[PDB]
Design a protein around this ligand. Structure first.
Ligand SMILES: Clc1ccccc1CSC1=NCCN1
Length: 119
């Protein structure tokens, strides 16, 4: 039903939401999450957001090369070679991030639960 869909899902350890796919319904109201970095984890429906892509004007967190966390706003999407990129704005400047370098803080994800939450 929801298996195969791209989602943004909570990693319970640090409370942030990361890009992945529901691979399997595994019962207990849980889904097998394949994260885009290849990490795998069973995640509750309430911790999964079904937005693909993350919409324009969403508040997000960009991961740097150094795994620095920076807040920004989605102002663009681009398909390049079958892959999604996000234009993220901070302080009037925009930078391109691969799909998997865009995450949601606990509060940025919690804020999307009403419209996009699998629940
Ligand atoms: Cl999609 C992504 C991109 C960058 C960092 C993490 C993830 C997945 S969550 C996780 N990875 C390893 C442990 N938890």
């Amino acid at each position: 039903s929801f298996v195969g869909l791209r989602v943004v899902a909570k990693w319970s350890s640090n409370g942030y939401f990361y890009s992945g796919k529901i691979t399997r319904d595994v019962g207990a109201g849980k889904y097998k999450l394949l994260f885009d970095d290849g990490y795998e984890c069973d995640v509750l429906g309430k911790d999964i957001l079904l937005c693909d892509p993350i919409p324009l004007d969403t508040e997000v967190t960009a991961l740097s090369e150094d795994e620095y966390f920076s807040a920004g706003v989605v102002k663009g999407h681009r398909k390049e070679s079958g892959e999604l990129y996000y234009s993220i704005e901070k302080e009037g400047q925009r930078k391109w991030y691969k799909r998997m370098a865009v995450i949601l803080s606990l509060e940025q994800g919690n804020r999307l639960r009403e419209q996009y939450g699998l629940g």
